[PDB]
Amino acid sequence: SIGYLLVKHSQTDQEPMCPVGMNKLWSGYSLLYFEQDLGLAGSCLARFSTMPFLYCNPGDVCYYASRNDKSYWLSTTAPLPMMPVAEDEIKPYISRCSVCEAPAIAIAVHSQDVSIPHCPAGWRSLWIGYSFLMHSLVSPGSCLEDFRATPFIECNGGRGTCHYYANKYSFWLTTILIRTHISRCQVCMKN
Amino acid sequence: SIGYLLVKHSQTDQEPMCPVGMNKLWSGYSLLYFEQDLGLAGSCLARFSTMPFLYCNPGDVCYYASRNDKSYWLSTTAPLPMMPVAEDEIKPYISRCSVCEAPAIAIAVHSQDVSIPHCPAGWRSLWIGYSFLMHSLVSPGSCLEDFRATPFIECNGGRGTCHYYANKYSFWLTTILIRTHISRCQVCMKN
Amino acid sequence: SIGYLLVKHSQTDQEPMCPVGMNKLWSGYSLLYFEQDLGLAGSCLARFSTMPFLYCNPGDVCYYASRNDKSYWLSTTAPLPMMPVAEDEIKPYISRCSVCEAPAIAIAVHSQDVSIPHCPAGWRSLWIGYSFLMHSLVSPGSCLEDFRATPFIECNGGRGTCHYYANKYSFWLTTILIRTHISRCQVCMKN
Amino acid sequence: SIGYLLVKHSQTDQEPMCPVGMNKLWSGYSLLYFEQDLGLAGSCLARFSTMPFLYCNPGDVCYYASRNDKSYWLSTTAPLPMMPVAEDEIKPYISRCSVCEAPAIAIAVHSQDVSIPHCPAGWRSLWIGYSFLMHSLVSPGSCLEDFRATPFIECNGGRGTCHYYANKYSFWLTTILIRTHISRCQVCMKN
C-alpha cells in the first residue's frame, strides 16, 4: 500500500504520541462509522459527536440529520459501568487517536501464537498488540494494543445513551487466561 | 493517496488559478455526475453540456443519448433566481474548476469548530473552507471554499431547465448565523 | 494514478509501436471482456481466442469452458463485410495492442470540440484521438485514435461467428460530417 | 500496481525462498479464503488453522466462530489419497508461501502457448509457471509453478475433514499430454 497516513489508536482517554520521525497531522477520537478500516485516516475524527451532520432543504431551513441516530467508536480499556451512559459522560470511555505522516510503508504481521512476531530485518517496531479482524490483516488497523472482549461502543443520538456493541461480523484471531488464546501482532515500518 | 491531480472548484463564474508550483492541466466546469468525489479529475469537465453523449446503432444512424436527461453540477455563490432557468442562461450559475499537477500529497483537515484547523508543520495551506460530506473526509473534495445551503443544481436536458437540487444523502459537518455552525477545513500540501 | 503500464490500441491489424523511451512488455489483441478499461493491461491479450478457458472436474476429466460462449473485442478501421464472419477469418478485423513501460504518468485530456486539446506545458503528446466513454475520462482508454460508429465486435464461441456489437451503455463524447460532432482528445505524458 | 509485497507459493510442503534482493517479511500457508488474489499478502497465513476466529458476546463468554466452518487452501503437488483426510493429517498437502519485500514492480506475462513468454528487456525472471485465472492476469497470482487439475482443497472445521475442491468459477488459460494445452507464464521484475 501507499498509506502515507498511519493511524494510532490509544484505547485510553489520552492522545497517543506519533512515533519519532513522523509529523502529527491531527488528533481526535477513534471512530468506526456512523449509521471501516481502523488503519485509515477516516477512523480518526477530530471532535467526538453523536450527531455530526446537518441537512439543508432548498431554502433557509437547515436541520440536524436525526434519522440514522447510531454511531460506533473504539472504547478505552477502562470498564464501562453496568448501566448505559449518557452521551455527555461518554468521552472518558472513547479511545483517542492520532494521524501520523509515515515516510515509509507500515505493515502488521501476525503470529497466531502467544509469541510476538518479529519485524523483518531493517524494519522498526511501532507497536505490539492483539490480532483483530473486522467485516486487511496486513493493515495496521488489525493490530490493537489492548485486547477487549467487546472493543466497541454504540451510541444513540436520539436516545442520548451509549453502551457496548456486539458485532456479528468482527472477530479476534486465535492461537493455533483469555488473552493467552488471542493471536499477537506487531506493526512494523521499513527504514 | 497518490492523487497527483488536485481539483480546485471556484464556486464562481471565474476559473480558479492553480497554486504556484503546479501546472494547470485543464480547466472547465464543476460536474458532480450525469444520470463522485469533487476531489477527482472527473469532477472537472472542459465544457458545460447537459447532453454530452452520443449513441450509435449498428450502421450510420447515430443519435444523442436522451433517456437519462439529468445532470448535476456545483453552483456558484451568486443566488439562482426564484424561477427555473433555461439551459442557455445557466452557465453564470455553474462553478468553474481547474485541475493542477500537484508534486506532493494534499489532504483536507477538519476542525468541527468555527476555528480553521492548522496545517501540519512544514505543510503549505492551499485553501480554507467548510466541511462537506457526500454519499473521504481526508480528500480535498470535502472542503469547499463557500458554504451554500443547496450547493448543487440539477438540469433537465429534455426539459431544457435547471434549478437547485435537494440531495438526500450529502451533508455538512457541524460544530460540536448559520455559517457559525458549520465545521471549517483547510486543504494542506506537504513540501 | 500509478499506471506504469500504458496500453496502446492500433485499431488496425498491425501491432502498434511503443513510444520512444518505453519498453514493450508484450503485444497482442484488443480485448474488452469475456462473458473493462481499455487503458488497463488486461485489455491486451497475447493471442486471439474465442474459447480461452479450461475447466477441470475433480479427476483427469478436463473440458473447455463452453457455457459463457461470448467474447468482445475492439475492431479495426477496416469495414466488416455485410454478413457474419467465421472465427477463423476474424483476426484481420480485431485491433492489435501493445503494453508499454511508462516511466511517468499519462492522462487523457478532452476538448468537447473539433480542436485537439493541448498537452500541459512540459508534457509530451503520445497520441490524439476521439473521446470514448464506457460503462475514467482521465484514463488513456477513453482516447481512441479512430472513430468508429460501432467500435466493437462480439464473437460466439459455440456459434463460431462474429459481428459488430451494439453496446447499450458506452457512448462517444460530443462537441458542445459525423466525426465533426465527436469530442477530440490527446493522451499526454509528463517528462 | 504498487505491490511492494510479492507472494510466492511453493505448491510443496517446503517454505519457498524469497528471491535474492528481497527481505522475507513472513512465511506460512497458502490460503484462498475462509467462508482472493493469490498475489496479495492475505493469501499467506502464518499458521494453518481451519477455525482461526473467536467471537465474544457482551461479557466474559467468548466462543470459537463455528457457523461458517469452511476454509479453502492451495494444495501441494503430492497427490491427496482417495479418501477424505482428517484436519490433523492435512498439513503435508497444504502449499507453503513466503511474503517478500519487492523493491520494484513485478508482473505476470502469459503466452497462451507451450512456450514460456520472455521477460521484457532489463527485467529479471522470478519464476515460470502455468496460467491460472480465478473469479488480474497481470498479477503474479495468476502464475502457479505447477499445474494441478484441482489445485485447491476444502476443509470442514466442524466435520474435521478435507478434500479437493471443484471451483465453478476459476479456470486455466489454454493454448491457442494435458499440460501441453495449458498456457505458460513467467513472473518478471524490473531492475
Author numbering:
A (entry chain A), B (entry chain A), C (entry chain A), D (entry chain A): 3 to 37, 45 to 144, 155 to 195, 213 to 227
Authors' text:
Basement membranes are extracellular structures of epithelia and endothelia that have collagen IV scaffolds of triple α-chain helical protomers that associate end-to-end, forming networks. At the C-termini, interactions occur between the trimeric NC1 domains of two protomers, forming a hexamer of these domains reinforced by sulfilimine cross-links.
The asymmetric unit included two subunits. Following application of the crystal symmetry, each subunit formed a protomer with fourfold molecular symmetry. One of these protomers was isolated and the other generated a homo-octamer (α2NC1homo). α2NC1homo resembled a canonical hexamer, except for an increase in the number of subunits to four per protomer, enlarging the equatorial circumference somewhat (∼70 Å diameter) and widening the central tunnel (∼30 Å). Therefore, the two self-assembled noncanonical structures of α2NC1 or α4NC1 subunits may lack some structural elements that are present in the canonical trimeric protomers that could intrinsically restrict the formation of protomers with more than three subunits. The comparison between the structure of the α2NC1 domain in its noncanonical homohexamer and the same domain in α121NC1 (α2NC1α121) revealed that there are conformational differences that might explain the greater number of subunits. The presence of an isolated tetrameric protomer that is not associated into an octamer in the α2NC1homo crystal is structural evidence of weakened interactions across the equatorial plane.
